[model samples]
Target chain A: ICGIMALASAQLYSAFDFNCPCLPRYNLAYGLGVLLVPPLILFLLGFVLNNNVSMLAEEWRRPDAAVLRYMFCSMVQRAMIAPAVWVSVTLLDGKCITCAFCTSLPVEALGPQGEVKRVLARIPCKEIYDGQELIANEVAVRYLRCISQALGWCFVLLMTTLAFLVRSLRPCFTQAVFLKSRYWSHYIDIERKLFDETCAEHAKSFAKVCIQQF
Target chain B: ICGIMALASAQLYSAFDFNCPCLPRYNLAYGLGVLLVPPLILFLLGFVLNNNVSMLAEEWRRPDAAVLRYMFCSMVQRAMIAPAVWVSVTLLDGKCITCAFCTSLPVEALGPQGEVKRVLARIPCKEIYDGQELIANEVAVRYLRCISQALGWCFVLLMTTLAFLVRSLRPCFTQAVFLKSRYWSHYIDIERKLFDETCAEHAKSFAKVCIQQF
Candidate 1:
């Protein structure tokens, strides 16, 4: 993504005699914009596709509605966290950008003869400009990196959150949806039957343990 | 994925001189190679990472052994299928190449025109020679297109396989690790107590319903 933006930015920079009058930083800005689109598209696509595919896969793998509810809710559990984290990062990115331009301070830079020069020829001294701009750029970069880090954390938290949501919230949701789908209704019945069969199997093991103890 | 690959392939193709003999189809080959590496790397990485991360997360989530088993196993359940599918495609690619080449033999073009005949007889049979070469070139291009299509299938299959592996197999594997985690033993005790509590809760609800009926 960075490389593509670099090439694209270079091309646009050169096209109008290196002083294109457009935002010199357009590449990075455009890249961030482009970068944000596909994943959102994918996440949205996943929601639609996930419903159909997971529903089928779940129905096939687990014929019981009770188990399916137990499982499917768990399966999609990570998605809830994903969107929240995404929104948070978006909010953070907006704040950092706002801070940079809003500060209204002139930047400093060293000129050719090692003399101090104000950035954009506006600030009074180069020393303060250099330090302040450096700080600002560093701040922006750090915020960007933090946003990335937060994104990673968000995904992790989301997945963990999903795990909890699936386990904690599923029982009632399963009941709510039970009568809605013929397939799910069938699944609940099969799931209960299977649960009983599992109990019977364990009961046999318990009986063996009782005999052994006796 | 195809979209990503197409973008990657375009960038790669733009980077190299395809006409150079030393690098004939260089970008194309490299693009194909890149596709092969990332998926395999990701699969292995996910497997090892899932095991490692779940081991740590298990301590915190403290889910029951059975539930954790379901969760962890759910992690691995969906993951191992892609590389396996890639291995299958790689094997299939070998067979497909052999078939295409074998069929290519009888389909060969007419032999090259003798320079001596052209020079001595002053006859321009250049058209005939050109036609022969064109036929050979067309066949070769068609063969290449077929191979590309095959690679395209492998890529699609790789991702589909990845979906199942990541969602199903990888989770299953994680669930297993979670089940075995130290926290799970304690979790199981809590779960059994909770299950018993739930049973009591259900009994109360049933009693209330019965009294209301009376």
Candidate 2:
């Protein structure tokens, strides 16, 4: 992992150099850059942990409830927190804006920590009479920024909806599927017991009737 | 590869549809749209074929040498040609003019061999100069045309050099690296017989001197 991090860092730095003199204000893009790493780590850990926990949960429920049910449940809770925190922080970051207004106003001045709203209010957003007149090469940047902001909000909403659905339906999903029975796993005994209850009883009744007829 | 191509296509389409339409000609930047397939194919082939040929090359080298060598050798050829053709076509397209001199000329008047070049030459080559004012934006087309021509020539020269180098270097690269040698491969009587002459004589002299001195 450390080797991967170092190699990624070197490659990114080389890309920066290849592109030439880094823009200072365009380094604002680096804000999104700084926002990239934590979610990546969380995402990597979540993939591994989710797979392992799901496997353990399946086994613990089937083989021995007493041995690992509590441990698996605790691990599942911790595993879930990784994704939950990732979603919460990512959603919040999507809404965050650190423009002139955000820095200018006192933290207390904004009611209920409306940072994005305050930043939007403070920005000297201009209306272009002619799109051609605003900037030479950066018309694309303005348009792309709009698309990026739209997509960010879209993802946040999608994640929030997923989280709500998962929270609401989790109990029904678990009980209906994985946690129905413990000894139902031992196929041979279960099958034999079921035969004695149904087929064996029916056969014995038929034999008793045949003996009476004879 | 698919993701990257999709991203490129998405960015180009977004810029054209969302950004100001004044830079419509800059949309030719997206004519780079042709670039989507070849590099990705090359990269993916390199990635996949590296493992595959390494697995299958020995059998292939025996009777199907071309197929095995094709992976490495043809890839370099394609790398060169792909860049060369793209640059050349772009240069030609950019430099093209639709003036009366070239367009008005009869197709057969060029004597059949170089018809397009002659017809295009007749149409016109010079830019429309304005006596009233000189604007930098007006020079963009001419500037880019010249740059494209220069870059095209460079790509052609580079490819030619690479092709010659590969063709010339094949012998020195593939010889004596791992192929089995017949002489030392088997155990025979010569192994015991040859060792006696050098080692046995030295030992005999050393034993005689030691015995006489003692």
Candidate 3:
């Protein structure tokens, strides 16, 4: 469902015609707003869509077992994947609002000198601004595209490192703790299913008794 | 804290200028909305205030064990107490919107025909209508108040019964499960405190090592 949501959102975004205002002042706000808002929304949406949020919240309140903590952390970590992907696609396409913002940064900030900051920033709004050729603007677009792609890669790498630490490092500290936590996580899973069944059985008898009383 | 919340909300409700529109068409909506919405908000507020919503969700997801299940259920039941109090107060006060709706019911339906229906419905705004005197209005208000108070008493009774059952009945099932689950709950509580301490110590030493590497 999360993947589907991400995909649908991306498709939805694509369907919308995003034309940059290209006016120097308005450009920055529009770019950053586009860059930041969608991913944040997608992240929140992903969090909401995942059934595990309630479970994570519940586990947080329960007694703190390492395994329970591990299960919750893993669940949350997994939930972030879709949002990350959406952000990644936005960056890779080089059309994300943030990418435009990055492209728009002052030429002096991009490096030592004379790199056309205004010109680069105008790269995203090239279609709107007259007299800017595709060939002339390619470098600016490429620079922002590379930066965006690098961010995407860095994000992926960070998540991978965390996953490795969570999966691999814990067992090194104590096998018993790892095993016990996993066992309890499994135990919690089953307990709820049985509870519903028990409630149903109890309800049937409860109704029967009330009917007989009447 | 829950009781405090309940009382505070009831007091807050009292403080609010809840003037009945008393215009027959809108009175019922206004009154009913007041009666229901405040109590629901109070219930949600109480639920949110209790930090254990997450824990309950966590416990729900884990494997089936009667002891742990009992703990989660009890925690949730206890959380409901404050919301219940708020609703009871609203009902007993004879000022809730439901009371208004009840009072607005056609007078004929309130007695032998109208009266029983009106009495059963527990309307509070009856006095505003033409022909009903203070004496007649007092009867409607008093009737609803008694019913509300009775409901309050019954809620107390049910909770006490459940607590008694939970406390007294569990021992009869299996002493081991009860003892083990309680021990684990306590054990997790300590583990978390220690984990926080341990994380701090680890952070200090790790930072030192990383600084040395640099």
Candidates, DockQ? 0.02, 0.02, 0.01
TM-score of each: 0.27, 0.27, 0.39
Candidate fnat values, all: 0.00, 0.02, 0.00
Cα deviation of A54, candidate 3, in Å: 4.1
Instruction: Write candidate 2's Cα lDDT for A33-142 as tens digits.
Output: 44455546654565473434554656757634432444444344444444444433333323222211122232232112353333333332323212332222233333
**Tens-place lDDT digits, model 1, residues B1-214:** 3334334434543463322111222333443454456557645655674444555475556544355446555555445454444433333333223222322233332213344322212211122333343233333333343344344344544555455445433344343454345344444444455566666888999999889865
Select the stronger candidate by DockQ from 1 and 2: 1
**Model 3 ranges with Cα > 4 A deviation:** A1-17, A45-65, A97-99, A102-123, A132-167, A170-174, A209-214, B1-214
Q: Residues A1-214, candidate 3, lDDT per residue (tens digit)? A: 6667767777756743444533344456554555565555555555554554554555464454465566655555656766666666666666664335644444444431223443454456445332343234555566766777787788778867866777666433476766876676687678867864565555555444444332
The 10-residue segment of model 2 chain B with minimum total lDDT is: B15-24
Q: Please give the TM-score for the first chain of candidate 2.
A: 0.31
Q: Which prediction has more favorable TM-score, 2 or 3?
A: 3
Q: Among these predicted structures, which one has the highest TM-score?
A: 3
Model 2 compared with the native: what TM-score? 0.27
Q: Which candidate is the best by DockQ?
A: 1
Computed on C-alpha atoms, the DockQ of candidate 2 is 0.02
Local error of candidate 3 at residue A94 (angstroms)? 0.5
What lDDT is reached at residue A142 by model 1?
52
Which 10 consecutive positions of candidate 3 chain B have the poorest summed lDDT? B164-173
Pairs with steric clashes in candidate 2: B101-B122, B101-B123, B102-B122, B102-B123
